[PDB]
Curated annotation (Swiss-Prot), chains A, C, E, G:
Pathway: Aromatic compound metabolism; beta-ketoadipate pathway; 3-carboxy-cis,cis-muconate from 3,4-dihydroxybenzoate: step 1/1
Name of the coding gene: pcaG
Keywords: Aromatic hydrocarbons catabolism, Dioxygenase, Iron, Oxidoreductase
Highest taxon in the source lineage: Bacteria
Binding site for 3,4-dihydroxybenzoate: 133
Record organism: Pseudomonas putida (Arthrobacter siderocapsulatus)
Catalysis performed (reactions): 3,4-dihydroxybenzoate + O2 = 3-carboxy-cis,cis-muconate + 2 H(+)
Subunit note: The enzyme is an oligomer of 12 copies of the alpha and beta chains.
Name of the featured protein: Protocatechuate 3,4-dioxygenase alpha chain
A GO molecular-function annotation: ferric iron binding
EC number(s) per entry: 1.13.11.3
InterPro entries: Intradiol_dOase_C, Intradiol_dOase_core, Intradiol_RC_Dioxygenase, Protocat_dOase_a
Curated annotation (Swiss-Prot), chains B, D, F:
Source organism phylogeny: Bacteria, Pseudomonadati, Pseudomonadota, Gammaproteobacteria, Pseudomonadales
Any one biological process term the GO annotation gives: beta-ketoadipate pathway
InterPro entries: Intradiol_dOase_C (IPR000627), Intradiol_dOase_core (IPR015889), Intradiol_RC_Dioxygenase (IPR050770), PCDO_beta_N (IPR024756), Protocat_dOase_b (IPR012785)
Gene this protein is translated from: pcaH
Cofactor: Fe(3+)
EC category: oxidoreductase
Matching CDD domains: 3_4-PCD_beta
GO MF annotation list: ferric iron binding; protocatechuate 3,4-dioxygenase activity
UniProt protein name: Protocatechuate 3,4-dioxygenase beta chain
Catalytic activity: 3,4-dihydroxybenzoate + O2 = 3-carboxy-cis,cis-muconate + 2 H(+)
Length: 200, 238, 200, 238, 200, 238, 200
């Protein structure tokens, strides 16, 4: 068969992942421009939400050194690739869980509907990439919202998961923190209630 | 009009199949007994037709849709892609690549094919594609099946697609056949064995391309064609 | 020595060559635009001629499945490479012999004079390429005209053929088909009166 | 009634594929975490059904005619023949061999197959044959095509025919898959790679049989099945 | 040591196992004679029972594509190997679970007592073979009855299982389906309450 | 009468010597220029004569006694034994094996043999044997000597015995030659070199059989003959 | 692929082929029972014919050392395989050309019609095998009769030969020798008018 150049192998982000990718969370001084957890500025269009969650290992214990990267569309269902800190909205962001803050946070807007390759509309989602020590190659997952039940049942990606019980793990539960709209998304890497991870 | 500014690398007639190859029976009465007369290259040989202005239909390269009588062909959906380059490695752009084949069963849509395998009412077996700026071509078709023929008592042609490539000149014009990777019928075919060097038979074998395959849809095969090298004229007529 | 990438080996056109290069002759439906035997349209400049011939094998039997490709200059001695079906003249064309029509026909104009690399004029000729089952690598030949005796005697290509009796095989005899000027060119692949084939 | 007079050679569970083979995704949730309990052979294990009296239809082994809706299937007509012997080389006569497959395009005649390749209106894909006195079986069918499946993002099953062989007992019962010679998709399939030893993968590859092919009609493939060795009981209960 | 010819390796039955071994269940037309779930005809000797069960994977989800083969003795404790559809009893039969019927059913009589190689009587049992996608080599197991407590405690095969809690998995609970005597046998392939699988 | 129930494995004409082999001078004018026409096997080709009812003389296989003019021949007394099987390894019973050779000096009992080596008044050179139930044949003769021939200026044929085997059909009928182990003239002979493959020449070399030799009497040579594989007809005319 | 035992290679019958297969023609004493040119005894059913012919090489010169074997059906179109010299008719025979008799002869009856594998009737024919020095592997041919023109045009074997001119070589011309019905069949191994040889 036809053999291409092999891809560079993945390695764990390591315990000190924060020094290079999450400077503030590492307790080290920051640079002028940093890629962080504020995707939307207070003046951006769409429903403003706060996202939080915890990451659990196979023994039900907290992962206090995880690093997450998010990729989502805007309120109109468009991906803003040109990253700039002066923009009202950026599609990319970065968050993490520290020993002080065993919970990660993300300030953004609720994403609009985007279509797949075949033209079938997918439910409002947030693409997540999980990195940490002990994770050799990053884990890919999606975050869905509970108040979007109608769209969730019609999603071509969510319906690709054979068992309905496993589809519930990708769904974030709506709560309210200080009068602000919030959704909680806990990730269970291994064991009971194990979150669905993707390959693409 | 076209000009005489190019020279083509002389064909290696020991690499290519010989005219007289006895095991391929029909080549006995259809091969010259006299030697080919060697002539220098002139404007007649170094020029050739350009097909950039030919009116190609939308599905001319898509054998899954160019015949169509209310359906899809039965067989292994495959993409046949590759590049057309010369002996120097230089890409050959805006060139005509034409192809023809049998159906999944080994039956051609011709009156002379009396083979018992049925015709597919949704398959014709003809395709044409003009290469892009980098020399790339692509076809979408079904994988042809082997077929028997009256040569030896039990001779079977391997799965193949015939190819016709024009190139910059009539000197570069070529008609060949593509064979599929790992087909056990390849070392047994007299038409294949007409080529003496086994390294030459390898150039005709299309390799499975998983990287170019469309997931959950169709597989792909890579076939690169190498035509005669084109060089500029130097120190001619002193 | 210096080795370049090897040229893709040739293989026979096969018996079913017609389904891909001569659709009408294969009894199959044609596409909007096809490359066939009409090089010149009625309003094209030059002396309009009709070419016809038969192909013979080594036992003197007809080759009813041969495919021929022609390349010739116009009446002014110029090669029109830009193939278009709207042109009054096209330098390229294809023809074939079928079981129904064991004779090929070609509608064109008599070509003008073109010079070789050395600046020496060649006699009015038509470059032909023969393909068929049993022919592993196509055969190259030239069609010269009998009423161009003066030019044929001076041609630098025709004089490269040592024996004069072999030069006669490349010469087409003038005849008349329906009051129209015609030239007959029979190709003998093997045997007595074998046609001269070229290598370049 | 049947009697306890035979003993079967113990299965080599390192030759056969393991229960847990991660690359074949569905095997993660469907494989025992606990070890298999080893039990001695009794009349329950050493006996099995005999199918000599089953009413076989005329075309039960001929997949080219057993479905038929006024026609012949599109695809490469092939004969799948072979012998069923035990580990001692002793032939296994009057045994049931059952087989199933996809069409030339890779589409099965099942409601759960949602693959875009069309169904052949003249092909079912089921066959059964009772072996003769020397252990020989034979089928006539069309060569199946590869098909994609939801495992990895670009996983493709090679061309195969599933096989079911009964044998003298329930201890000899086996379900396996036949693969075709030279198919480049074989070393890439996770189901094939579930078998660790490459010499074991070789036993599953059916070889092209030109000697058994019908000239101008159909090709043939040879596939020999080896079942557990049957020996007589000795020195039991002293 | 002495090496014999290697046994042909096993491969999974696959998802489409039904088209070749369970034609009716595949929604395809059947042949004149089929091997299915009716082992005993209404006029057969012995206590007529109905067997039914479900198959579970490691996540406690149903295996809706499993294929099962059964081998059992008659009421008098004899194995009827000569399969014929005219017989009042057949010792062999096949059943399956579909997406429509995620539960298999089998119509038979309660088997009699058969002795082992050593002459020791085994408790009334039904030999089962499980095939499905994801199962590379079929799983062997036995179905024992709960109302045969005395015989189950004496069985030489059942006593080869070290732990008593594991023996309980091979025991079918007596229930009633439409006033008919029935026994439920659920198979847990993996996890908590995993069914004992055999090797012989 | 005979019936059409058998099919024979197609001959490998690249294994057998070619018609045109220039070094063997007489083959130049006695070889076809045209290709052989391939025809399917019918009752004419699949049937053949059975010589079980032919009246063999008691000494027809014994060349030491079948000529006899009051004495024994001069030369190395040998037994030429072997078995006649087909390509499947199946024995060929009750078949006709005919053989002829020259004397110890390379002289044949024929009018055209003008070679200066004298004739042996007690040796003819003809033999015929009908194979038994297991396909075995046996001949008792003297080892023939080499002889020169008008081909090249110094050409010598090795020591050989010509053989003619009938087989179950005219499709299996074969005429060949047996050569002796270690003869240095074998790689030099143009008739032997008519065979392109050196493994094919090995099949014609009779090996010394000390086990079958008669102590204080005669030596023995083993020569097994392999005829075309016979198989039953299957899936013909549907 | 599957490889069987290779067939024993063929070798030329040699110049002295007669000593072992044609004893009388070799001028050597015969045995009690010999296989020769009298297939039919004067009392056998069917039209009694005499067959003669000569064998020519590529230079038009006679082959005076050829050995031929024939196989034909009886007047009813049946093959008599059990060879016995007491039979009125035998399907097998042997003839040869000597330096004295450069012409071969065969006394037999005209064969009846036999069908092919597909059930299509073949024209009356005689299967011939030609052996000689210079012929490495024997040549297979068929003899057809000229007074059977209707059947000859409908023969599935004779129509397999592409060119009609080559079909005429397998046809024997009817003549009369001493008031006896005779057919002449000349075989031209090489060159002009070369006889069609078969492979099966
Ligand atoms: Fe580190
Ligand atoms: Fe072809
Ligand atoms: Fe499958
Ligand atoms: Fe000799």
């Amino acid at each position: 068969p036809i053999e291409l150049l092999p891809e560079t192998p993945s390695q764990t982000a390591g315990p000190y992942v924060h020094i290079g990718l999450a400077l503030e969370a590492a307790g080290n001084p920051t640079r002028d421009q940093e890629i962080w957890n504020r995707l939307a500025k207070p003046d951006a269009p769409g429903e403003h939400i706060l996202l939080l969650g915890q990451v659990y290992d196979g023994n039900g214990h907290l992962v206090r050194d995880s690093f997450l990267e998010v990729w989502q569309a805007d309120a109109n269902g468009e991906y803003q690739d040109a990253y700039n800190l002066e923009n009202a909205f950026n599609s990319f962001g970065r968050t993490a869980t520290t020993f002080d803050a065993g919970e990660w946070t993300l300030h953004t807007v609720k994403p609009g509907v985007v279509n797949n390759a075949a033209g079938v509309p997918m439910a409002p989602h947030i693409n997540i990439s999980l990195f940490a020590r002990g994770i050799n190659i990053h884990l890919h997952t999606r975050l869905y919202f509970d108040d979007e039940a109608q769209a969730n049942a019609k999603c071509p990606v969510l319906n690709l998961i054979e068992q309905p019980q496993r589809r519930e793990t990708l769904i974030a539960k709506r709560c309210e923190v200080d009068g602000k709209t919030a959704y909680r998304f806990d990730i269970r890497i291994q064991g009971e209630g194990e979150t669905v991870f993707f390959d693409f | 009009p076209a000009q005489d500014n190019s020279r083509f690398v002389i064909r290696d007639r020991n690499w290519h199949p010989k005219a007289l190859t006895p095991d391929y029976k029909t080549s006995i009465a259809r091969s010259p007994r006299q030697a080919l007369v060697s002539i220098p290259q002139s404007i007649s040989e170094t020029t050739g037709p350009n097909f950039s202005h030919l009116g190609f239909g939308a599905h001319d390269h898509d054998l899954l849709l160019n015949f169509n009588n209310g359906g899809l062909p039965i067989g292994e959906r495959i993409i046949v892609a590759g590049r057309v380059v010369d002996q120097y490695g230089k890409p050959v752009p805006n060139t005509l690549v034409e192809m023809w084949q049998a159906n999944a069963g080994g039956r051609h849509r011709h009156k002379n094919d009396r083979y018992l395998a049925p015709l597919d009412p949704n398959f014709g077996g003809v395709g044409r594609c003009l290469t892009d700026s980098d020399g790339y071509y692509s076809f979408r078709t079904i994988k042809p099946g082997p077929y028997p023929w009256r040569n030896g008592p039990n001779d079977w042609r391997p799965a193949h697609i015939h190819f016709g490539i024009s190139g910059p000149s009539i000197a570069t014009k070529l008609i060949t056949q593509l064979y599929f990777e790992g087909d056990p019928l390849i070392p047994m075919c007299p038409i294949v064995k007409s080529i003496a060097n086994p390294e030459a038979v390898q150039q005709l074998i299309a390799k499975l391309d998983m990287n170019n395959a469309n997931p959950m849809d169709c597989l792909a095969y890579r076939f690169d064609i190498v035509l005669r090298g084109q060089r500029k004229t130097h120190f001619e007529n002193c």
